[PDB]
């Protein structure tokens, strides 16, 4: 059960890194919208960041959340410098996929997905 830490000694430091990453992303959402000529509002991008942060908010391991913070830093560095395209930023906002069924009756009508 004894493991080697990377950056976060405990859960408090990992939560500090998470808050720092969210601060940076909330800072850089308007510049990402303006620079890439994205045709969405700032609120859509900021609540997308909030949705992703709440989606990945089930982890209790310091190493896993530390690696999540590192990968968010990679995404932030690829966004702050113009290395992505319009499509790479817009891939988060799924606009071409039709809404999949969720209730049992509609999925029973469509196919064999359990």
């Amino acid at each position: 059960t004894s493991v080697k830490p990377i950056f976060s000694r405990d859960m408090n430091e990992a939560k500090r890194r998470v808050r720092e990453l969210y601060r940076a992303w909330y800072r850089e959402v308007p510049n990402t919208v303006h620079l890439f000529q994205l045709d969405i509002s700032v609120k859509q991008g900021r609540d997308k960041v909030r949705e992703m942060f709440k989606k990945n908010a089930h982890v209790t391991d310091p190493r896993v959340v530390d690696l999540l913070v590192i990968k968010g830093k990679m995404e932030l560095e690829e966004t702050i410098n113009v290395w992505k395209q319009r499509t790479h930023v817009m891939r988060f906002f799924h606009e071409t996929e039709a809404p999949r069924p969720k209730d049992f009756l509609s999925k029973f009508y469509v196919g064999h997905d359990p």
Binding site: L105, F108, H112, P114
Partner: protein
């Protein structure tokens, strides 16, 4: 312990006396090459592939036959062992025809694999090969004896396990042919298994021939449902299409064999399927209709009922999941008239205790028995692998078999006591020598067939057999671990439905007729439109449309046993699960999914969505259905015997005639087999 010490490649290992060199090398962990030796057949020793060298001995011994001795060092990979193997491969491939690209064994051939990994890589044979004329033994084995190597597994299987004694070796020397010497149609209940035990491509599955290839197939483990044995099989498919069915290895059920019906029901599984819901039009002709309209019609006609006006009949190929789903759905409408096709007597204990409707010991318990008394059954065609197990105990364990019924062939010698059921009344009172025969037995066994319980006096026969079994169990030398009362079944959906609390037999429907009938593949025709009122809303839920589908009002297509994950319980109470090999064709879905969608559209939604919740419900209603490959013992035969002694039922003097007498009535049993071309060809071959 008397385990002597031997050496394999300088490493010590302890073996029981009588252990062969091959068995010792297998125990260490090297699989010795072989062609004629089989672990479930008698030792022949006539291919010399297994020749290994023991050190300090100037001769190579046959590892498949020669027993080991103390201090023997088996040089498994020395020089002369490899020289002997290379010489044997050269002799074996000296006369073999260049037929690999036209062969059906290519890619799954023992000769090719052993030739690459043990034999040489070039041929010194500069002469002409032999050419043996082909024969025919039926429409189940394509026969090319040019490729036979005279390994003599055919004769040993046909004499020891199948027990028909028609195959043989005619000739002397290089002109010896493995045939029958006449135009004889070799047809048994385990014929196709010879295709599994040909190491070359001499014998080929005829319906499978020239259709697929082993390296492009996907193997999916599954459970056989055509009988109540519960054989474990592997279905090999090719790009979402079932290609062939092979036996699995399970030492307690189906060791490495299957019946021919299991082997050749697939081509009828891919014919006459239901691929779309059908509802009645204005005229009354069944026409295609989407899922929503049919489900809404069924829900509308179902919400108008309350009480005993809806029923349910379950066919022979229904899993426990759909059974419990329909049970919950009809319990929401508060109907307890849930019925099965096959009749079992509920007088006395009935289906409450588990001990009086299962093969109580095991399938393998025949190896621990010495006296077997079959009552009114034909186990050669009902449970063929159980009959094979009885024959194996007859051969090795020196069994003592008897039968009370019609004089039908059982591929061995039995004691025909007559077809009168009153003979049973003789055994309980000691007025027969067979009563003393059972009395001096140590671990006896009484097996009662399911087909003897489908008459009008099944309860009396069950009471008599139970009285006999409980008389032997207490008065004679039975320790207490041994179980005497067994019942052999013939329907894969009978034990699972009886474990869930279904009412066996269709007599409940015939007592009070309902205004709506549910059929889960009930093609047996237990009830018709003459035993039903004028306006009956019959709903059919099955894959094959054979009998109950033309008379149905709303047809709901379902999934076959190879097309859904299904929980099945065999005749000994063991629970097993199948796996999805190919998705159902067209718009057909799984049966419990259809029932759950119907309940959701009717406002009576069941509290399960996926398969694991249905299995949790199954564990709630009966835990033994969710413990897979685990048999649980059912005690309290004494309580069932006490409860069965009150209602004295009168017997019938008619002979105990099983419905299956010859092989011509064995191929056509279920819906899958009745819509098959191979089965029709087999029937045409055996009746001509």
């Amino acid at each position: 312990s008397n385990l002597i010490e031997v050496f394999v490649d300088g490493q010590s290992v302890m073996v029981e006396p009588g252990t062969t060199v091959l068995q010792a090398c297998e125990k260490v962990g090297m699989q010795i090459p072989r062609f004629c030796y089989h672990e479930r057949l008698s030792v022949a020793g006539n291919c010399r592939m297994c020749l290994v060298e023991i050190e300090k001995a100037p001769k190579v011994v046959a590892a498949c036959a020669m027993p080991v001795m103390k201090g023997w060092n088996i040089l498994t990979n020395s020089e002369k062992t490899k020289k002997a193997r290379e010489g044997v491969m050269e002799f074996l491939l000296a006369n073999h025809p260049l037929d690999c690209p036209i062969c059906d064994q290519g890619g799954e051939c023992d000769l090719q694999d052993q030739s690459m990994m043990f034999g040489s890589d070039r041929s010194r044979f500069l002469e002409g090969k032999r050419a043996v004329e082909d024969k025919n033994i039926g429409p189940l084995v394509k026969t090319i004896m040019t490729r036979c190597i005279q390994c003599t597994r055919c004769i040993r299987f046909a004499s020891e396990i199948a027990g028909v004694d028609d195959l043989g070796t005619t000739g002397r020397g290089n002109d010896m042919q493995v045939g029958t010497y006449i135009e004889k149609m070799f047809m048994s209940e385990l014929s196709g298994n010879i295709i599994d035990i040909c190491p070359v491509g001499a014998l080929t599955s005829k319906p499978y021939a020239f259709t697929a290839r082993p390296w492009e197939t996907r193997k999916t483990e599954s459970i056989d449902v055509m009988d109540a044995v519960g054989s474990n099989i592997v279905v090999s498919t090719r790009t979402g299409e079932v290609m062939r069915i092979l036996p699995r290895m399970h030492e307690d059920i189906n060791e490495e064999w299957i019946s021919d019906k299991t082997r050749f029901a697939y081509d009828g599984l891919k014919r006459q399927r239901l691929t779309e819901p059908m509802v009645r039009n204005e005229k009354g002709l069944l026409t295609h209709t989407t899922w929503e309209d049919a489900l809404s019609r069924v829900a509308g006609m179902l919400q108008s009922c309350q009480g005993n006006d809806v029923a349910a009949i379950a066919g022979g190929l229904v899993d426990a999941e759909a059974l419990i789903a329909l049970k919950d759905l009809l319990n929401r409408v508060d109907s307890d008239t849930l019925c099965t096709e096959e009749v079992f007597p509920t007088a006395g204990a009935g289906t409450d205790l588990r001990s009086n409707y299962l093969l109580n010991t095991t399938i393998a318990g025949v190896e621990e028995a010495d006296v077997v008394l079959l009552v009114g059954t034909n186990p050669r065609f009902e449970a063929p692998l159980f009959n094979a197990r009885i024959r194996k105990s007859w051969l090795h364990n020196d069994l003592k078999v008897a039968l009370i019924g019609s004089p039908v062939d059982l591929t061995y010698r039995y004691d025909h006591l007559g077809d009168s059921p009153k003979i049973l009344q003789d055994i309980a009172s000691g007025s027969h020598p067979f009563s003393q025969v059972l009395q001096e037995a140590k671990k006896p066994m009484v097996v009662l067939g399911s087909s003897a319980l489908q008459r009008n006096d099944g309860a009396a026969i069950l009471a008599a057999v139970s009285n006999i079994a409980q008389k032997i169990r207490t008065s004679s030398g039975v320790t207490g671990d041994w179980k005497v009362m067994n019942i052999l079944h013939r329907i894969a959906s009978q034990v699972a439905a009886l474990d869930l609390g279904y009412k066996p037999g269709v007599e409940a429907i015939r007592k009070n007729p309902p205004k709506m009938l549910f059929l889960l593949g009930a093609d047996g025709g237990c009830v018709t439109r003459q035993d039903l009122p004028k306006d009956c809303f019959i709903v059919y839920q099955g894959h094959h449309g054979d009998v109950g589908a033309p008379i149905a009002d709303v047809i709901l297509p379902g999934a076959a046993y190879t097309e859904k994950s299904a929980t099945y319980v065999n005749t000994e109470g063991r629970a097993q699960q199948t796996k999805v090999a190919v998705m159902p064709p067209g718009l057909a879905r799984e049966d419990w999914k259809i029932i759950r969608a119907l309940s959701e559209i009717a406002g009576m939604t069941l509290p399960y969505d996926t398969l694991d919740q249905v299995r949790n419900r199954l564990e709630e209603v009966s835990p033994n259905l969710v413990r897979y490959d685990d048999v649980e013992g059912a005690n309290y035969f004494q309580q069932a015997s006490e409860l069965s002694k009150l209602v004295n039922q009168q017997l019938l003097a008619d002979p105990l005639v099983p419905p299956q007498l010859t092989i011509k009535d064995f191929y056509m049993t279920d819906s899958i087999s009745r819509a098959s071309q191979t089965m029709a060809k087999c029937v045409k071959a055996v009746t001509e």
